[PDB]
Design a protein around this ligand. Structure first.
Ligand SMILES: *[C@@H]1O[C@H](CO)[C@@H](O[C@@H]2O[C@H](CO)[C@@H](O)[C@H](O)[C@H]2NC(C)=O)[C@H](O)[C@H]1NC(C)=O
Ligand SMILES: CC(=O)N[C@@H]1[C@@H](O)[C@H](O)[C@@H](CO)O[C@H]1O
Ligand SMILES: *[C@@H]1O[C@H](CO)[C@@H](O)[C@H](O)[C@H]1NC(C)=O
Ligand SMILES: *[C@@H]1O[C@H](CO)[C@@H](O)[C@H](O)[C@H]1NC(C)=O
Lengths: 106, 109, 190, 232, 101, 116, 116, 103
């Protein structure tokens, strides 16, 4: 019966609404709001930059989500970075896969 | 909810192998993430009994197999040497155990 | 049956209701991977029997009442197409299926709710044609109707003129608006 | 006999998808087949009024220059004249269709207000109110549609647009739709639609249902995990 | 988010420049509300002007390079807040052209 | 809330329904004293579409949008020759809704997990 | 709170104060329907201690505790010459005071699997 | 938030007179006195017959409807560390304050 207002995978913010029918009458049904937020707690400030400092302050403004820095990797999105891999003399910039499950070429 | 689908309820006699096929939406992520067959323990979350990434438990050692068919969009877990102990609530799914994306299979021997 | 709520099938306009004597446009999605073999296009007999009647096919065979007044025109090539049906008869109200004999057989269904009203383009030739200035932002065009392939032929090719018109100064013919990639409504002249 | 100039508003033309120009001429004399026509300045004098009330009992015997014409004229929509050719009227006259600057053109703001809790407690009926502010130049058809099905005009009642005291040019309007309390309790969407000239697509469907009003309960959950970070 | 630092005397007037995305749905100037901490509109794309700032400000639209200008005729030394311009229906978080006086 | 977010103005609406003589007369009192008729606009009575002799009327009083957040009251007084003692007062405040209770619940566990 | 705990009854009090002319009239209405004069008892106007020329008078409506729980309205309407419309109405129900209770929970190393 | 500061320095012999703006909408007025770190200004005098204990006897109020002012006079004015002596109208006291006054 939940009406999923929003599901933001950039911030793990899911808002659903439900009219719970406690009593068996009208005007006693509680309209709810089920905000669910998952805090990374180990993700960096710059999700696509591994070496950025750890993120400690998490701001969530429920208007910017109802309608940009992300907090959590989206599992369907391929996140990659560039790393120098020097082997021999030949330093080469290579495309490292931050999320390896989602970054397989089709 | 989870788009994973499987047998809501398997059943069999002891000493007979069972095959449980779970369907997942075919995408690159779903095709390349970890496929896990866990047992919902009475108090405590899943203990992963077998995984697509070569893991098999204390038990399911030589009794079980877990094959991934990305083209079909499925994965099939085969459990041989079934016993009365191997009855309860299991989950088959993708990714992390404590994470949702799964389906509940009630196995009774 | 278990219906996945995370589907790769894109949205299809469930109803494309149109003006009697006018035309419609039905964009039917198909699997991009596998290209078409036969773009069958059907009707419904009932909610139980419902044997669909392939109005048109990739070969170009058309039914009795839609002989002429119906076409299928592949493009938008990128994994969909556009079957058209001008000359707004009422009886045509119902459900139409975008069959293909590829692999994943989605038989996408579209509801055609016909409503009588003002026709957006002008009448029957011999060669009148007319589409409203608001609808005219595109490029009102003419095609010489062939069940095999629609081919555009000269007519009054100017600005709004009474608005469109048809001239073949020296059969079944079409005088319709085109978006380019996609296509707008039709016009039936003789 | 009388002459008046009025341009068809956007509310009428949207309903028709065309324009029915009219030069109000009533109280005519007992002359059959009145040859009075709305005459455009461009030369496109309209046809004689088709199916005029030839013998209706009213002593006025109205014969208006109204006729059915194309929409392109109001797609242009410049100033239009009116010349009346009537035997009993010898005075030449031209009237230019006041809608020129038409005050201004502001975008109406639509707000849908759900029923008050008190009338729901009364247990008989509920009234959802659709209120449009701004309203630069009058012009608005308001329709009430539920589940994509336009509801009966009897249920919803609109209002004659009155001005704003915050700006004389501005115009607001209201439309109340009444239903049984049970229908609103069930959860049906009943969302009202506004049609204005200012409208970008020339329509709005602002929104409301029981379970989208102010919430009474909030269980925010904030799960914190050191190995979350990849949002399923 | 830049904040122009303007000064003027009791009679000194200040002009404010803000971007115009050509959306024209709503472009506005917002004084900082220090009594509650949010943002309150003073002038927008529809005549609403604050009672305390009654007829002392006006807006100008320029398409040459998309100017929205706020011109203040008078100035009663009342400490001008953070005149943060913005766009859209949402005033509080539509902020962009930050200006302080 | 929609219009409130605009942060420009606030519109309050007395809506009066069921009065049969249709000579009803709304009036707004805010801060115990009547407000000047410039602010509030009252529509003429119109027939009740859903019934017979009952009519209806609005009265929308507009106000500074932050006044509404100020925490005012704005009573409205339908006075019409049919109410028991001829006047009926109603009041609306920013907190006029029945109290909302929160339920924040912070799971600082690293086991107990979520549900897709 | 004591009367509610006893659960036998409850006494809502309308305290009219500060009105200079002695005569006043208080009557108690429910759901727009005036209550029977037996239920409410109104005190005679008595001079106020700190106000020399201004008086005060209570009015007590006795209602069952269950009625108070079934969150009712009980307005108390007062009529005086000095009032603008010669009457003012004040309403208080069971939910008039409550101020939103945050029920903050704090799951820490706990299980049940329960999804979150 | 208009802030006149009358700052009458007569001390014991001073008789401070402050004219605060007045709506003239027959609403009651009051002269707030910001109570020691409460934030809730307590009313010294008002249209209501209330006068504070400390400011009793010496505080008086006079009207200027045509001039749109209300003049509050502390005659004795004996020193009492004067904080913002806000004057404001309305049934609500702290919220309805308009003009601050420092003495
Ligand atoms: C860290 O954050 C910035 C944004 O705050 C972004 O950097 C750019 O994004 C591209 C994406 O590939 C990077 O590859 C570019 O190197 C970045 N531009 C620059 C400065 O090169 C991205 O989020 C992160 N980029 C970093 C810091 O490497
Ligand atoms: C604590 C929490 O997160 N949510 C609670 C839920 O557990 C409880 O059952 C419900 C009572 O109806 O109130 C809410
Ligand atoms: C808060 O109140 C709810 C409602 O009864 C209660 O069930 C829940 O357990 C309480 N919240 C907690 C868990 O603190
Ligand atoms: C929020 O409260 C509702 C009460 O109906 C409950 O069903 C739901 O489980 C709660 N949320 C969570 C995450 O438990």
């Amino acid at each position: 019966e939940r009406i999923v207002l929003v599901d933001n995978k950039c911030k793990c913010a899911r808002i659903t609404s439900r009219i719970i029918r406690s009593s068996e009458d009208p005007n006693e049904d509680i309209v709810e709001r089920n905000i669910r937020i998952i805090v990374p707690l180990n993700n960096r400030e710059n999700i696509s930059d591994p070496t950025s400092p750890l993120r400690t302050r998490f701001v969530y403004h429920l208007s910017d989500l109802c309608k940009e820095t992300c907090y959590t990797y989206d599992r369907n999105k391929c996140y990659t970075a560039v790393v120098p891999l020097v082997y021999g003399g030949e330093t080469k910039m290579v495309e490292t896969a931050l999320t390896p499950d989602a970054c397989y070429p089709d | 909810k989870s788009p994973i689908f499987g047998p809501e309820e398997v059943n069999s006699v002891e000493g007979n192998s069972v095959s449980i096929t779970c369907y997942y939406p075919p995408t690159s992520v779903n095709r390349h993430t970890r496929k896990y067959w866990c047992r919902q323990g009475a108090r405590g979350g899943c203990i992963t009994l077998i995984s697509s990434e070569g893991y098999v438990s204390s038990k399911y050692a030589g009794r079980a197999n877990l094959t991934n068919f990305p083209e079909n969009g499925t994965f099939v877990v085969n459990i041989a040497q079934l016993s009365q102990d191997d009855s309860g609530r299991y989950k088959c799914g993708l990714g992390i155990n404590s994470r949702g994306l799964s389906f509940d299979v009630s196995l009774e021997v | 049956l278990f219906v996945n709520e995370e589907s790769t099938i894109p949205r299809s306009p469930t109803v494309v209701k149109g003006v009697a004597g006018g035309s419609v446009a039905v964009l039917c999605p198909y699997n991009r991977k596998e290209s078409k073999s036969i773009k069958y296009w059907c009707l419904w007999e009932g909610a139980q029997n419902g044997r669909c009647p392939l109005l048109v096919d990739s070969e170009g065979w058309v039914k009795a009442q839609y002989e002429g007044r119906l076409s299928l025109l592949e493009e938008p090539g990128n994994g969909t197409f556009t079957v058209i049906l001008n000359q707004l008869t009422s009886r045509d109200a119902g459900f139409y299926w975008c069959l293909t004999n590829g692999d994943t057989l989605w038989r996408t269904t579209v509801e055609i709710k016909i409503i009588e009203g003002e026709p957006n383009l002008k009448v029957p030739g011999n060669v009148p044609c007319h589409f409203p200035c608001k609808f005219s932002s595109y490029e009102k065009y003419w095609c010489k109707w062939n069940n095999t392939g629609c081919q555009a032929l000269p007519s009054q090719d100017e600005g709004p003129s009474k608005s469109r018109l048809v001239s073949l100064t020296l059969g079944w013919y079409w005088c319709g608006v085109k978006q380019g990639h996609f296509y707008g409504e039709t016009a039936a002249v003789y | 006999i009388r002459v008046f100039a009025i341009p068809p508003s956007f509310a009428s033309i949207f309903l028709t998808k065309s324009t029915k120009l009219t030069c109000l001429v009533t109280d005519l004399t007992t002359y059959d087949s009145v040859t009075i026509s709305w005459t455009r300045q461009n030369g496109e004098a309209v046809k004689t009024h088709t199916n005029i009330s030839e013998s209706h009992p009213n002593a006025t015997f109205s014969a208006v220059g109204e006729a059915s014409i194309c929409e392109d004229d109001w797609n242009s929509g410049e100033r239009f004249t009116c010349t009346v050719t009537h035997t009993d009227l010898p005075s030449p006259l031209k009237q230019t269709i006041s809608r020129p600057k038409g005050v201004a053109l502001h975008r109406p703001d639509v707000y849908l207000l759900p029923p008050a809790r008190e009338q729901l407690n009364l247990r008989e009926s509920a009234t959802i109110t659709c209120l449009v502010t701004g309203f630069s130049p009058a012009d608005v058809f308001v329709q009430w549609m539920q589940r994509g099905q336009p509801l009966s005009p009897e249920k919803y009642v609109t209002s004659a647009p009155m001005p704003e005291p915050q700006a004389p040019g501005r115009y607001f309007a209201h439309s109340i739709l009444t239903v049984s309390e049970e229908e609103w309790n069930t959860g049906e969407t009943y969302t009202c639609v506004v049609a204005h000239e200012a409208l970008p697509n020339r329509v709005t469907e602002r929104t409301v249902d029981k379970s989208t009003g102010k919430p009474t309960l909030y269980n925010v959950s904030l799960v914190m995990s050191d190995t979350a970070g990849t949002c399923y | 988010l830049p904040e122009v630092k303007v000064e003027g005397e009791l009679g000194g007037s200040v002009t404010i420049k803000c971007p115009l995305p050509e959306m024209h749905v709503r472009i506005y100037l917002c004084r900082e509300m220090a009594g509650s901490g949010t943002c309150g509109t003073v002038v927008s794309t529809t005549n609403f002007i604050k009672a305390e700032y009654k007829g002392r400000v006006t807006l100008k639209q320029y398409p040459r390079k998309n100017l929205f200008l706020v011109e203040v005729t008078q100035l009663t030394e009342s400490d001008s807040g953070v005149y943060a311009c913005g766009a859209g229906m949402n005033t509080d978080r539509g902020k962009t052209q930050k200006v302080t006086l």
